[PDB]
Write an enzyme that holds these catalytic residues in place. Structure first.
Site, PDB file in Angstrom:
ATOM      1  N   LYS A  46      28.997  32.457  47.293  1.00  0.00           N
ATOM      2  CA  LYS A  46      30.460  33.319  47.626  1.00  0.00           C
ATOM      3  C   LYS A  46      30.777  34.316  47.072  1.00  0.00           C
ATOM      4  O   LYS A  46      31.039  35.127  46.022  1.00  0.00           O
ATOM      5  CB  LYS A  46      30.924  32.197  45.876  1.00  0.00           C
ATOM      6  N   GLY A  99      30.362  40.698  38.338  1.00  0.00           N
ATOM      7  CA  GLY A  99      31.728  41.217  38.863  1.00  0.00           C
ATOM      8  C   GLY A  99      32.173  42.064  37.991  1.00  0.00           C
ATOM      9  O   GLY A  99      31.561  42.289  36.629  1.00  0.00           O
ATOM     10  N   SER A 100      33.732  41.713  37.476  1.00  0.00           N
ATOM     11  CA  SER A 100      34.684  42.662  36.418  1.00  0.00           C
ATOM     12  C   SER A 100      34.190  41.532  34.809  1.00  0.00           C
ATOM     13  O   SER A 100      33.401  40.098  35.249  1.00  0.00           O
ATOM     14  CB  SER A 100      35.701  42.504  36.702  1.00  0.00           C
ATOM     15  N   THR A 101      34.288  42.488  33.302  1.00  0.00           N
ATOM     16  CA  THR A 101      34.034  41.784  32.547  1.00  0.00           C
ATOM     17  C   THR A 101      35.360  40.616  31.977  1.00  0.00           C
ATOM     18  O   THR A 101      34.678  39.692  31.454  1.00  0.00           O
ATOM     19  CB  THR A 101      33.355  43.000  30.747  1.00  0.00           C
ATOM     20  N   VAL A 138      36.501  38.813  34.604  1.00  0.00           N
ATOM     21  CA  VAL A 138      36.151  37.330  35.335  1.00  0.00           C
ATOM     22  C   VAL A 138      34.726  36.383  35.430  1.00  0.00           C
ATOM     23  O   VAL A 138      35.227  35.800  34.789  1.00  0.00           O
ATOM     24  CB  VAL A 138      35.969  38.061  37.224  1.00  0.00           C
ATOM     25  N   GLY A 139      34.309  37.726  34.585  1.00  0.00           N
ATOM     26  CA  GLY A 139      33.168  36.599  33.413  1.00  0.00           C
ATOM     27  C   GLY A 139      33.251  35.878  32.735  1.00  0.00           C
ATOM     28  O   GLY A 139      32.520  35.148  32.535  1.00  0.00           O
ATOM     29  N   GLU A 198      26.570  40.263  35.487  1.00  0.00           N
ATOM     30  CA  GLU A 198      26.532  41.580  35.786  1.00  0.00           C
ATOM     31  C   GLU A 198      27.536  42.132  35.779  1.00  0.00           C
ATOM     32  O   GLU A 198      28.339  41.985  36.950  1.00  0.00           O
ATOM     33  CB  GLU A 198      25.962  41.295  36.663  1.00  0.00           C
ATOM     34  N   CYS A 237      28.947  50.387  39.643  1.00  0.00           N
ATOM     35  CA  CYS A 237      28.774  49.417  38.040  1.00  0.00           C
ATOM     36  C   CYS A 237      28.302  50.660  37.290  1.00  0.00           C
ATOM     37  O   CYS A 237      28.477  50.544  36.191  1.00  0.00           O
ATOM     38  CB  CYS A 237      28.088  48.303  38.336  1.00  0.00           C
ATOM     39  N   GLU A 288      37.072  50.642  32.539  1.00  0.00           N
ATOM     40  CA  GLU A 288      36.161  50.866  34.235  1.00  0.00           C
ATOM     41  C   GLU A 288      37.506  51.751  35.099  1.00  0.00           C
ATOM     42  O   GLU A 288      38.274  50.775  35.690  1.00  0.00           O
ATOM     43  CB  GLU A 288      35.342  49.828  34.514  1.00  0.00           C
TER      44      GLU A 288
HETATM   45  N1  NAD Z   1      24.982  45.187  38.903  1.00  0.00           N
HETATM   46  C1  NAD Z   1      26.057  45.087  37.928  1.00  0.00           C
HETATM   47  O1  NAD Z   1      26.510  44.775  36.894  1.00  0.00           O
HETATM   48  C2  NAD Z   1      27.266  45.101  39.245  1.00  0.00           C
HETATM   49  C3  NAD Z   1      27.172  46.036  40.164  1.00  0.00           C
HETATM   50  C4  NAD Z   1      28.207  45.910  40.723  1.00  0.00           C
HETATM   51  C5  NAD Z   1      29.849  45.484  40.845  1.00  0.00           C
HETATM   52  N2  NAD Z   1      30.123  45.160  39.411  1.00  0.00           N
HETATM   53  C6  NAD Z   1      31.202  45.326  38.867  1.00  0.00           C
HETATM   54  O2  NAD Z   1      32.338  44.352  39.666  1.00  0.00           O
HETATM   55  C7  NAD Z   1      33.642  45.127  39.735  1.00  0.00           C
HETATM   56  C8  NAD Z   1      33.915  45.083  40.954  1.00  0.00           C
HETATM   57  O3  NAD Z   1      34.156  43.908  42.125  1.00  0.00           O
HETATM   58  P1  NAD Z   1      35.082  43.288  42.273  1.00  0.00           P
HETATM   59  O4  NAD Z   1      36.042  43.672  42.123  1.00  0.00           O
HETATM   60  O5  NAD Z   1      35.165  42.451  42.944  1.00  0.00           O
HETATM   61  O6  NAD Z   1      35.247  42.098  40.597  1.00  0.00           O
HETATM   62  P2  NAD Z   1      35.521  40.825  40.150  1.00  0.00           P
HETATM   63  O7  NAD Z   1      35.742  40.435  38.867  1.00  0.00           O
HETATM   64  O8  NAD Z   1      37.628  40.867  40.586  1.00  0.00           O
HETATM   65  O9  NAD Z   1      35.436  39.618  41.366  1.00  0.00           O
HETATM   66  C9  NAD Z   1      33.729  39.392  41.599  1.00  0.00           C
HETATM   67  C10 NAD Z   1      33.568  38.570  41.776  1.00  0.00           C
HETATM   68  O10 NAD Z   1      34.510  37.360  41.222  1.00  0.00           O
HETATM   69  C11 NAD Z   1      35.312  36.510  42.093  1.00  0.00           C
HETATM   70  N3  NAD Z   1      36.441  36.006  41.332  1.00  0.00           N
HETATM   71  C12 NAD Z   1      37.375  36.147  40.923  1.00  0.00           C
HETATM   72  N4  NAD Z   1      38.312  35.100  40.120  1.00  0.00           N
HETATM   73  C13 NAD Z   1      37.511  34.094  40.039  1.00  0.00           C
HETATM   74  C14 NAD Z   1      38.042  33.576  38.984  1.00  0.00           C
HETATM   75  N5  NAD Z   1      39.172  32.892  38.817  1.00  0.00           N
HETATM   76  N6  NAD Z   1      36.754  32.436  39.200  1.00  0.00           N
HETATM   77  C15 NAD Z   1      35.264  32.847  39.863  1.00  0.00           C
HETATM   78  N7  NAD Z   1      35.442  33.696  40.656  1.00  0.00           N
HETATM   79  C16 NAD Z   1      36.603  34.563  40.905  1.00  0.00           C
HETATM   80  C17 NAD Z   1      35.841  37.457  43.126  1.00  0.00           C
HETATM   81  O11 NAD Z   1      35.779  36.959  44.497  1.00  0.00           O
HETATM   82  C18 NAD Z   1      34.546  38.108  43.426  1.00  0.00           C
HETATM   83  O12 NAD Z   1      33.418  37.229  45.293  1.00  0.00           O
HETATM   84  C19 NAD Z   1      33.041  46.139  38.418  1.00  0.00           C
HETATM   85  O13 NAD Z   1      34.099  45.827  36.905  1.00  0.00           O
HETATM   86  C20 NAD Z   1      32.175  46.791  38.561  1.00  0.00           C
HETATM   87  O14 NAD Z   1      31.751  47.564  37.290  1.00  0.00           O
HETATM   88  C21 NAD Z   1      28.906  44.685  38.711  1.00  0.00           C
END
Ligand code: NAD
Ligand code: NA
Ligand code: NA
Ligand code: NA
Ligand code: NA
Lengths: 491, 494, 491, 491
Positions: C181, C234-236, C238-239, C257, C291, C389
């Site tokens: 996804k 992604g974000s902490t 959404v994690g 991550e 990140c 962040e």
């Molecule tokens: N290696 C790493 O640790 C790493 C690498 C790159 C970016 N990041 C992190 O990514 C973030 C930026 O990316 P973003 O804005 O896409 O983050 P995000 O948390 O908004 O979303 C990441 C992914 O999750 C999906 N998502 C969103 N809401 C969801 C839900 N309710 N259930 C399931 N999936 C859902 C999004 O569609 C996307 O595919 C920053 O916090 C950055 O630090 C981390």
């Protein structure tokens, strides 16, 4: 005295759980380097005694309990042995000191402590030795079994008797091997005491066999034995040649060699001179230079050379050479025996004759076989003292300009056991560490390792590792097992 | 002919990226065992040529690009070499087959495929070689570095030329070593061809040096060289003694020995007799018994012995020995040379003289000629004390024996100075486990034979040697393990 | 000038085919240089995720992929790495148009790391090992490292190609089937990569790409009853939802991550010109949409004033503009309008809390989502800009006195992804490295890792490793197998 | 007969001391043999968990434990193992009265495995390794395997001593500080073990034991903002709440050891007498209060009728009664009234859905929670008794025709903890082992593992390993360290 002189209890050979005399009834004397007098008359093993010990080990491996015991059970007994070495540390330290001419407090803290530590580390390794399950090219299941090898032949030197016994015996015991140990004729006492402690700990009869005798007799018979599965040797580079030949002329058993050294210590511009001088003294003169990894070549960068040289000569003026049993001051004891004492003075004589300057020492003393700590200056790389292993309290002090020069000069040896770097610069330390062809490299320290740290040479300093999980390899048989699979849903 | 006879292009020594003649200008002939005729006149390396090769390898390691390249960089070059071996598989197969007396289709599928496979496995190992970060006795940080060793000396036999070259060169190349390869004088062509393909792949000059010559000349010079860091040897147990002596008399370099064998195959009463017979035929007669791991001793349990013996003799009636280049039906080719041919015929004659029963073969054959063809020989009523039972024949000779107990099968399998390979044929999981764990051999096959892959370590036990070829285990002999210790100031954890 | 690519893959990738969503719905992807629609992408929802999970289930349970040898999987995986390399320019331009990146930077960094991750795991495929264990008696024990099954992958918009490869490569090597996804902001690279995989020989159903919105497609994948694991980047915040989705469904293992607030520590020791140049790259690479970006820069008091002046001077030659039309372009536009406004909000908040604006702090647009790289001085640790962040080109520049203070301040975060140390001192480097609670610590460099280097968070930055042999663990089932032994001569 | 133990430890164990709950509240622990109160144990709540987490935080951040060498932590752990062995009889009697167990079985199995787990990890402590990596250029990369911090442990009532050891031992060896929440039904063993750890030399704050209710004490620990990880053992339903508690708090990694519905497959070639005896033990060990219990037994059609008859006659000699007063006692009472009624409810449900009752199915009591071991025949896969975890002495006996059918039926569960195969055929054994989706597969045995053997679920039985070197991963922080190299002669 200051330290209590021990009572010699174990003087016979140790075959199949018993203290027995040699087939010939012959004995050899062990002497105290402090006096030059006979300590004990030890049973002299020859070919026939080695045969009897190898037969005892063969029966213990092929039919005995030891390889049939779980790693947990073997590690249980190995820990009880470590506990006994600790309980009898004082007695063992005095017994090793009186035989090898060292300080009983240093032997207890360093030698006995490392012996107990090596036994404990491998006791903890015994229940966790792993083989692999492999990735196969098709519908097959493949795995490796890490089996006990069989009969391990051990030949060790006189400089660290207790440590040498433990460092070979400990990984072999955890692996599930039966042993035949040939200790050096100069210091055979500690190995016989340790054999008795292993019996008390619960090591089955035949698993540890101790055969004190001469090298070309007992040692050669063990290295040439047709029923010995491997040989782990520690000693000179020249005797190492004979161990390799003995295997080639017999059953081609794997040979593991811990040979000599001509270890360099490199001191840079940015070093704290007081710590660097104190480190160099310890590195060169610990155990009266009777250390394989001793920093026999000290390299000091030109900008701090004159200060280092002056501070070193001043430091040596407060150094005490004497009887460790009667003198508290004593920093250095006597050399092992007469032959070694003549050998170091001959090298000191060679050093003077070839044009090297004498900064400190370079003559015998006696409050016995005592030599003062020698420091040679204006040493050319081509000199005998610069290239050959003296194995005495002798240090070659040299000046250098560049990092490149320090590296090339450190590598200008047949050897490659140990090396040291003294610098605060992270990039210099990394470059020097990675460029010096040595098995062990210390940065801002010396000797410090622990039982998790593998120890072994490079180039003419040998091959194979003692200590670490790496030590177990020489005592194990790796067996690959392959079978087809019928309709496995994954491979 | 059914398979195109190859064009011989590489006959000179390969030193510092160039094809050069020997210092003496001397050549030695390589012959076709199908005819007994000279294929090519190959440059004869001696002491001086080995020195030149070792100096080229020393410059490549000490000052060249190879150890300074990343594992990823070495890996891409190694994979390009694996791709080239695959692209030129037919030519290499034809070349090895003409030099060794093999079937070109078998050599392509087995020998060339395993050579390309070993190169690929180690290309994937190159970017992931790891040392450790250690647990220290106090405020210290300790680690081990797994460094390229330096100059690797390689001495290999004539039976699997391409596979032998790859199995030694591949882990060494991945480790970042420079090499000096001494191929066997009987089959030196493949090693020369492989050297050219490595140059094409991008292996820097001096990293791979091929010195074809005689053993006591070129081989002894390499094993005795003062500037060679290690020696990996594959050959006989008797020559292994000389490799160990050459090290002892020189710079005491670590020696790794892949020696002979007298491999036992144990068949129990619960086995499918037709699969067990077919497995035994392949295990004993693959590559005309010129295999170190060949099942020269076959042990069949008393209840199925008579049936096995009859089925084996019947199976051998349909076996074809002939020219693999002109006969499609050919199951077996000629022996490597005249020396090997006479040696196998001498062992068969000795077998007859000591009282063993000849079940099948035992005499020369086959096409209109000319050629070193021997019928696959099965000996019955073999006593354990017999020469044919104990000594490595290295020809199409099988010793068929009977046994009663699992304990007896184990003791008899172990009644050898050797310990390379072994086989078990049983449906019983507990019998398989007991026999596998009790037989003192480096490799044990259960209900199969030969099958391993490059992840599987291969090495002897007892007089079959020590050290592993293949697997991540192979890398050890080409790496220097360096322990590094430094104090720590106020580390919150240790 | 770089050639604008033609968009060819806009549909969902399910069971080897490009298909529309069940609903026939599409969502737009925009170019941040203009704010205009690039393509209309098929919008996956619950029903489409179900279809993709069913395709992956059939591929794993009955298909070729887990039944192939590691060598076979390895060749296909390497063919895919060869294709990514062959089509590097097209993929770089595609990812650049979609994410607002420089096409030359995307090719050298993003595409190169994607090809590199695929190659590393192609070489891992034929050498995945389990163990043969040490047993408490007459038993033989071993572990099998089996492909797990169906791997669910949810990734962000900042590194589309790299994110795809870093999750897909170890999963592929392990023998898993995948459901990916990608983030809705940059869905194009994943669909291109899916086509490349098909050309390489990856069997149908093994790689399924379902672009869509997070609370729709993403939540459906995280909540799926037939998905064996979830790897999330992604974000902490959404994690939290990924962990809840597993808890409310089949309790599948989750690997996170998350975000970061990475500190870069510079000592008096440092070469100021290299330290300034390193800080600029560490903070402003990919317009702070990294990140692991050094959002917090700590400079020791003695060199602080010089560092601050050199940094402000360096920023004067920094170019923010269109990477497709301006050759001097160091920084492109922020991903989209939402991200653009979010960064501007944080900059405005920083001004309001009393932080000094050293450079930037305002939009540019040479119209596009262009923000000037921002450096904040006189930043207190309690400030929003110091703790949260931002994920934009914003640096918080701070002063420190002691090593102890630098460590405590570096650790004063809920995060723990990355950190950096700039020093020549080996003891200072070792102390900071071992004291900073971060998954990755760079010494005298930044970003540099390679595929052998495991990457993962500590504290609220997550858990689990991407890259290294470590990345395989999450895609494997470790199975312990135990059987008794009858009369084994050793155990 | 056996000696009823003295109850000495009833308070919470926080910062090396036995203290009362902040509220002064207590909860009763009862004897399943009588239904009477054994002791009144201090009832921990949120405030007490906070106190224990603060004590562990101080012990990790500022205390001796993470600062001691692996060798030092190993000696203390081995002293603890020695104490568990020395006080084995008292501990077995304590665990037996509290849990309804046989004191001789508890000593040989439970206490032996607890001492064994402590010994295995004591030997792991001095040999925990990180890696030195292969870098993409002139860089030196390595991983450090650091102690993580504060470990939260939540465990069940069925194996109190074993559960305590299996979590505490790898955490201790890793250098972590702990907060242990034992199950409210059997809190006594954990408090005794805490006292022994104090005697062994474990520093104050390193081991904190907080007995209390799950939704109070347990939920507070799982939700704690200063806890670095949580290792949970219990039901699949509570596992959902542990995952939610981390998601709603600090997103700490969660490791789940959940329930099971373990299948035992018996083929036609099996020795029926050994297969029946193995099934009896596999299903009825610890009155079916075992997570890995063979609750489903599959017997191949040709030997089914004989197996069924031999099983019913074997059960006629089985003794259910008081282990402290009856020597013949094969089975003790169910933990409490709640568990007793829950098992009786499942037996009644089994009768109601049409399953045949071969043996047992009714209470016995010579009063005090005794249930006869129940064997159900003519069981359909869709039945409640076939799918749900009863956690009592209940076995579902079924018939099968093919290997394929045995595999598909064994896998027809949401669980994947354990499984068993009884066959002489090597190819059948290999196929079944590799096809059954379970974390542990026993061939021709059951239960046997040892501390080198990793234990963990698949599917809804969880993720993460207890035992083996594998158990350490969850308690360690893997830190990647990267630095450039200047002129390294090799990379
Ligand atoms: N290696 C790493 O640790 C790493 C690498 C790159 C970016 N990041 C992190 O990514 C973030 C930026 O990316 P973003 O804005 O896409 O983050 P995000 O948390 O908004 O979303 C990441 C992914 O999750 C999906 N998502 C969103 N809401 C969801 C839900 N309710 N259930 C399931 N999936 C859902 C999004 O569609 C996307 O595919 C920053 O916090 C950055 O630090 C981390
Ligand atoms: Na003496
Ligand atoms: Na030839
Ligand atoms: Na976009
Ligand atoms: Na109770």
């Amino acid at each position: 005295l200051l330290f209590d002189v021990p009572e010699i209890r174990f003087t016979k050979l140790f075959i199949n759980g018993s203290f027995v005399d040699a087939v010939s009834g012959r004995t050899f004397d062990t002497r105290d380097p402090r006096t030059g007098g006979v300590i004990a008359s030890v049973a002299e093993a020859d070919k026939e005694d080695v045969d009897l010990a190898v037969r005892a080990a063969r029966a213990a491996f092929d039919h005995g309990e030891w390889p049939r015991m779980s790693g947990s059970e073997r590690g249980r007994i190995m820990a009880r042995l470590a506990d006994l070495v600790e309980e009898h540390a004082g007695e063992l330290a005095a017994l090793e000191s009186l035989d090898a001419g060292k300080h009983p407090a240093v032997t207890r803290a360093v030698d006995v402590g490392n012996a107990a530590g090596s036994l404990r580390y491998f006791a903890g390794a015994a229940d966790k030795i792993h083989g692999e399950t492999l990735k196969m090219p098709g519908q097959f299941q493949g795995h490796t079994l890490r089996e006990p090898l069989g009969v391990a032949g051990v030949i060790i030197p006189w400089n660290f008797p207790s440590t040498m016994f433990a460092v070979k015996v400990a990984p072999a015991l955890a692996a599930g091997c039966a042993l035949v140990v040939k200790p050096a004729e100069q210091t055979p006492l500690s190995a016989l005491y340790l054999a008795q402690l292993a019996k008390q700990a619960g090591v089955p009869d035949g698993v540890i066999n101790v055969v004190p005798g001469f090298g070309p007799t007992a040692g050669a018979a063990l290295a040439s034995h047709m029923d010995v599965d491997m040989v782990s040797f520690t000693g000179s580079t020249e005797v190492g040649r004979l161990i390799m030949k003995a295997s080639a002329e017999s059953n081609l058993k794997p040979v593991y060699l811990e040979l000599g050294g001509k270890s360099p210590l490199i001191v840079f511009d940015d070093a704290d001179l007081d710590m660097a001088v104190e480190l160099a003294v310890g590195a060169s003169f610990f155990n009266k230079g009777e250390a394989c990894v001793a920093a026999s070549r000290v390299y000091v960068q030109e900008r701090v050379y004159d200060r280092f040289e002056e501070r070193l000569a001043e430091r040596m003026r407060s150094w005490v050479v004497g009887d460790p049993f009667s003198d508290p001051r004593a920093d250095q004891g006597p050399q092992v025996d007469k032959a070694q004492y003549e050998r170091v003075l001959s090298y000191i004589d060679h050093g003077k004759r070839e044009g090297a300057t004498l900064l400190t020492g370079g003559r015998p003393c006696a409050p016995g076989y005592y030599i003062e700590p020698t420091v040679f200056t204006n040493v050319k790389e081509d000199m005998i003292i610069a290239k050959e292993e003296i194995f005495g309290p002798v240090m070659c002090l040299m000046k250098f300009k560049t990092v490149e020069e320090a590296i090339a000069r450190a590598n200008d040896t047949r050897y490659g056991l140990g090396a040291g770097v003294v610098t605060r610069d992270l990039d210099v330390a990394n470059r020097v560490v990675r460029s010096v062809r040595a098995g062990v490299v210390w940065v801002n320290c010396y000797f410090a390792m622990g039982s998790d740290c593998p120890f072994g040479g490079r180039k003419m300093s040998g091959f194979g590792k003692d200590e670490g999980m790496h030590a177990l390899d020489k005592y194990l048989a790796v067996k690959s097992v392959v079978t087809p699979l019928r309709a496995s849903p994954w491979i």
